Scaffold this motif. Structure first.
Motif, PDB file in Angstrom:
ATOM      1  N   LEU A 261     101.057  55.052 111.302  1.00 45.60           N
ATOM      2  CA  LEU A 261     100.889  56.233 110.312  1.00 45.60           C
ATOM      3  C   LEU A 261      99.596  55.612 109.277  1.00 45.60           C
ATOM      4  CD1 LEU A 261     104.094  58.010 109.978  1.00 45.60           C
ATOM      5  CD2 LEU A 261     101.919  59.146 110.427  1.00 45.60           C
ATOM      6  N   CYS A 262     100.004  54.214 108.919  1.00 42.83           N
ATOM      7  CA  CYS A 262      98.947  53.807 107.882  1.00 42.83           C
ATOM      8  C   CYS A 262      97.662  53.941 108.420  1.00 42.83           C
ATOM      9  CB  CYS A 262      99.495  52.439 107.512  1.00 42.83           C
ATOM     10  SG  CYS A 262     100.914  52.508 106.575  1.00 42.83           S
ATOM     11  N   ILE A 263      97.495  53.472 109.706  1.00 42.58           N
ATOM     12  CA  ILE A 263      96.084  53.317 110.392  1.00 42.58           C
ATOM     13  C   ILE A 263      95.622  54.920 110.331  1.00 42.58           C
ATOM     14  CG2 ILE A 263      95.228  53.246 112.718  1.00 42.58           C
ATOM     15  CD1 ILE A 263      96.968  51.059 113.403  1.00 42.58           C
ATOM     16  N   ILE A 264      96.490  55.886 110.652  1.00 47.37           N
ATOM     17  CA  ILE A 264      96.059  57.154 110.614  1.00 47.37           C
ATOM     18  C   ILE A 264      95.548  57.600 109.395  1.00 47.37           C
ATOM     19  CG2 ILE A 264      96.699  59.551 110.850  1.00 47.37           C
ATOM     20  CD1 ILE A 264      98.571  58.642 113.285  1.00 47.37           C
ATOM     21  N   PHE A 265      96.202  57.405 108.245  1.00 51.14           N
ATOM     22  CA  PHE A 265      95.556  57.815 107.099  1.00 51.14           C
ATOM     23  C   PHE A 265      94.512  57.038 106.792  1.00 51.14           C
ATOM     24  CE2 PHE A 265      95.432  56.552 102.544  1.00 51.14           C
ATOM     25  CZ  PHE A 265      95.269  58.001 102.084  1.00 51.14           C
ATOM     26  N   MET A 266      94.045  55.691 107.149  1.00 54.43           N
ATOM     27  CA  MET A 266      92.969  54.942 106.854  1.00 54.43           C
ATOM     28  C   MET A 266      91.669  55.483 107.579  1.00 54.43           C
ATOM     29  SD  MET A 266      94.433  51.212 106.724  1.00 54.43           S
ATOM     30  CE  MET A 266      93.266  50.618 105.524  1.00 54.43           C
ATOM     31  N   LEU A 267      91.935  55.748 108.823  1.00 53.24           N
ATOM     32  CA  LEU A 267      90.823  56.565 109.451  1.00 53.24           C
ATOM     33  C   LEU A 267      90.484  57.908 108.833  1.00 53.24           C
ATOM     34  CD1 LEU A 267      92.196  56.190 113.074  1.00 53.24           C
ATOM     35  CD2 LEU A 267      90.073  54.595 112.329  1.00 53.24           C
ATOM     36  N   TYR A 268      91.534  58.847 108.619  1.00 51.58           N
ATOM     37  CA  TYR A 268      91.178  59.941 107.962  1.00 51.58           C
ATOM     38  C   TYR A 268      90.690  59.820 106.541  1.00 51.58           C
ATOM     39  CZ  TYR A 268      92.750  64.541 106.184  1.00 51.58           C
ATOM     40  OH  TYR A 268      92.707  65.832 105.674  1.00 51.58           O
TER      41      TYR A 268
ATOM     42  N   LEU B 148     107.366  59.849 119.345  1.00 51.37           N
ATOM     43  CA  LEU B 148     106.524  59.846 118.119  1.00 51.37           C
ATOM     44  C   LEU B 148     105.152  59.367 118.366  1.00 51.37           C
ATOM     45  CD1 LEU B 148     106.325  61.096 115.255  1.00 51.37           C
ATOM     46  CD2 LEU B 148     107.680  59.254 114.541  1.00 51.37           C
ATOM     47  N   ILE B 149     105.233  57.960 118.912  1.00 50.32           N
ATOM     48  CA  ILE B 149     104.182  57.248 118.773  1.00 50.32           C
ATOM     49  C   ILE B 149     103.060  57.812 119.549  1.00 50.32           C
ATOM     50  CG2 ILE B 149     103.208  55.049 119.746  1.00 50.32           C
ATOM     51  CD1 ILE B 149     106.051  54.082 118.864  1.00 50.32           C
ATOM     52  N   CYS B 150     103.212  58.486 120.810  1.00 53.48           N
ATOM     53  CA  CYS B 150     102.183  59.067 121.463  1.00 53.48           C
ATOM     54  C   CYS B 150     101.321  59.945 120.618  1.00 53.48           C
ATOM     55  CB  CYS B 150     102.740  59.533 122.888  1.00 53.48           C
ATOM     56  SG  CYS B 150     104.092  58.382 123.453  1.00 53.48           S
ATOM     57  N   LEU B 151     102.243  60.902 119.960  1.00 54.36           N
ATOM     58  CA  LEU B 151     101.879  62.004 119.153  1.00 54.36           C
ATOM     59  C   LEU B 151     101.039  61.343 118.054  1.00 54.36           C
ATOM     60  CD1 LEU B 151     104.029  64.097 119.994  1.00 54.36           C
ATOM     61  CD2 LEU B 151     104.121  64.595 117.396  1.00 54.36           C
ATOM     62  N   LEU B 152     101.252  60.044 117.462  1.00 53.25           N
ATOM     63  CA  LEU B 152     100.326  59.656 116.484  1.00 53.25           C
ATOM     64  C   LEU B 152      99.102  58.793 117.080  1.00 53.25           C
ATOM     65  CD1 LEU B 152     103.204  57.889 114.270  1.00 53.25           C
ATOM     66  CD2 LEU B 152     101.631  60.013 113.980  1.00 53.25           C
ATOM     67  N   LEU B 153      99.269  58.278 118.426  1.00 51.34           N
ATOM     68  CA  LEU B 153      98.250  57.938 119.269  1.00 51.34           C
ATOM     69  C   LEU B 153      97.321  58.854 119.686  1.00 51.34           C
ATOM     70  CD1 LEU B 153     100.051  55.108 121.195  1.00 51.34           C
ATOM     71  CD2 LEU B 153      98.053  54.642 119.624  1.00 51.34           C
ATOM     72  N   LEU B 154      97.778  60.042 120.067  1.00 47.80           N
ATOM     73  CA  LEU B 154      96.928  61.249 120.436  1.00 47.80           C
ATOM     74  C   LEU B 154      96.127  61.606 119.201  1.00 47.80           C
ATOM     75  CD1 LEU B 154      99.405  63.590 122.658  1.00 47.80           C
ATOM     76  CD2 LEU B 154      97.034  62.795 123.190  1.00 47.80           C
ATOM     77  N   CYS B 155      96.559  61.592 118.101  1.00 48.84           N
ATOM     78  CA  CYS B 155      95.993  61.818 116.810  1.00 48.84           C
ATOM     79  C   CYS B 155      94.823  60.942 116.394  1.00 48.84           C
ATOM     80  CB  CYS B 155      96.730  62.056 115.506  1.00 48.84           C
ATOM     81  SG  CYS B 155      98.345  63.109 115.648  1.00 48.84           S
ATOM     82  N   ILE B 156      94.881  59.541 116.771  1.00 47.18           N
ATOM     83  CA  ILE B 156      93.954  58.454 116.532  1.00 47.18           C
ATOM     84  C   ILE B 156      92.827  58.874 117.694  1.00 47.18           C
ATOM     85  CG2 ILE B 156      93.244  56.426 116.970  1.00 47.18           C
ATOM     86  CD1 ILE B 156      96.469  55.482 116.121  1.00 47.18           C
ATOM     87  N   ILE B 157      93.016  59.419 118.482  1.00 49.95           N
ATOM     88  CA  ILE B 157      92.167  59.731 119.716  1.00 49.95           C
ATOM     89  C   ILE B 157      91.439  60.930 119.067  1.00 49.95           C
ATOM     90  CG2 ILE B 157      91.894  60.845 121.931  1.00 49.95           C
ATOM     91  CD1 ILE B 157      93.939  58.858 122.991  1.00 49.95           C
ATOM     92  N   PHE B 158      91.739  62.130 118.687  1.00 45.92           N
ATOM     93  CA  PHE B 158      91.328  63.158 118.069  1.00 45.92           C
ATOM     94  C   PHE B 158      90.163  62.664 117.018  1.00 45.92           C
ATOM     95  CE2 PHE B 158      91.459  66.975 115.109  1.00 45.92           C
ATOM     96  CZ  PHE B 158      90.734  67.673 115.878  1.00 45.92           C
TER      97      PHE B 158
ATOM     98  N   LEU C 196      94.101  52.254 126.335  1.00 45.40           N
ATOM     99  CA  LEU C 196      92.892  52.265 127.383  1.00 45.40           C
ATOM    100  C   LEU C 196      91.802  53.311 126.914  1.00 45.40           C
ATOM    101  CD1 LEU C 196      93.747  51.212 131.119  1.00 45.40           C
ATOM    102  CD2 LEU C 196      93.391  49.835 128.900  1.00 45.40           C
ATOM    103  N   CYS C 197      92.298  54.491 126.569  1.00 42.75           N
ATOM    104  CA  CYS C 197      91.748  55.638 126.203  1.00 42.75           C
ATOM    105  C   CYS C 197      90.846  55.233 124.869  1.00 42.75           C
ATOM    106  CB  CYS C 197      92.497  56.730 125.916  1.00 42.75           C
ATOM    107  SG  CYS C 197      91.501  58.426 125.726  1.00 42.75           S
ATOM    108  N   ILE C 198      91.716  54.590 123.900  1.00 39.97           N
ATOM    109  CA  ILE C 198      91.214  54.280 122.541  1.00 39.97           C
ATOM    110  C   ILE C 198      90.124  53.276 122.682  1.00 39.97           C
ATOM    111  CG2 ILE C 198      91.863  53.190 120.453  1.00 39.97           C
ATOM    112  CD1 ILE C 198      94.279  55.059 120.342  1.00 39.97           C
ATOM    113  N   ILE C 199      90.542  52.128 123.429  1.00 41.91           N
ATOM    114  CA  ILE C 199      89.544  50.992 123.630  1.00 41.91           C
ATOM    115  C   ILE C 199      88.234  51.567 124.349  1.00 41.91           C
ATOM    116  CG2 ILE C 199      89.231  48.928 124.948  1.00 41.91           C
ATOM    117  CD1 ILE C 199      92.362  48.643 124.698  1.00 41.91           C
ATOM    118  N   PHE C 200      88.268  52.503 125.209  1.00 42.45           N
ATOM    119  CA  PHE C 200      87.089  53.227 125.499  1.00 42.45           C
ATOM    120  C   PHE C 200      86.354  53.681 124.564  1.00 42.45           C
ATOM    121  CE2 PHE C 200      84.341  56.733 127.225  1.00 42.45           C
ATOM    122  CZ  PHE C 200      83.555  56.106 127.878  1.00 42.45           C
ATOM    123  N   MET C 201      86.766  54.654 123.681  1.00 43.48           N
ATOM    124  CA  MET C 201      86.091  55.080 122.574  1.00 43.48           C
ATOM    125  C   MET C 201      85.537  54.205 121.679  1.00 43.48           C
ATOM    126  SD  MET C 201      88.276  58.586 121.700  1.00 43.48           S
ATOM    127  CE  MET C 201      88.323  59.718 123.321  1.00 43.48           C
TER     128      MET C 201
END
Lengths: 27, 28, 27, 27, 26
Positions: free
Chosen positions: B19-26, D12-22, E17-22
């Motif tokens: 979550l912290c990461i996500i808010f930092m990229l956001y 939940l982590i896959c959710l948060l990882l999907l978001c990072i991708i988006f 792997l998907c994130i490392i690609f991007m």
């Protein structure tokens, strides 16, 4: 004793998550 | 037992930090 | 059996995260 | 037991990882 | 339930792997 390694691995993931966070701040 | 508790702890820590990461990229 | 798979995946997520830390420090 | 928590947290982590991708795509 | 733990774990490695690609994409 398979569980022991999973437990050591999650601990590392928590350390690795922190250095990623710190680095993003350093940007 | 004591080891499932450790994992559940760590998982909790992980979600909080993802979550912290996500808010930092956001943010930037 | 599934226990060892899990343990594999975790070691992998460590190396991948670890690899991510290397890309960030790169630039 | 707690496995309902591990499952959920993974879930939940896959959710948060999907978001990072988006956000690396959309951004 | 383990499969879920085994399925999601598989899924995360892909997603990493998907994130490392991007990050290696720009």
């Amino acid at each position: 004793e398979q569980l022991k390694w999973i437990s050591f691995c999650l601990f590392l993931i928590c350390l690795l998550l922190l250095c990623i966070i710190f680095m993003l701040y350093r940007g």
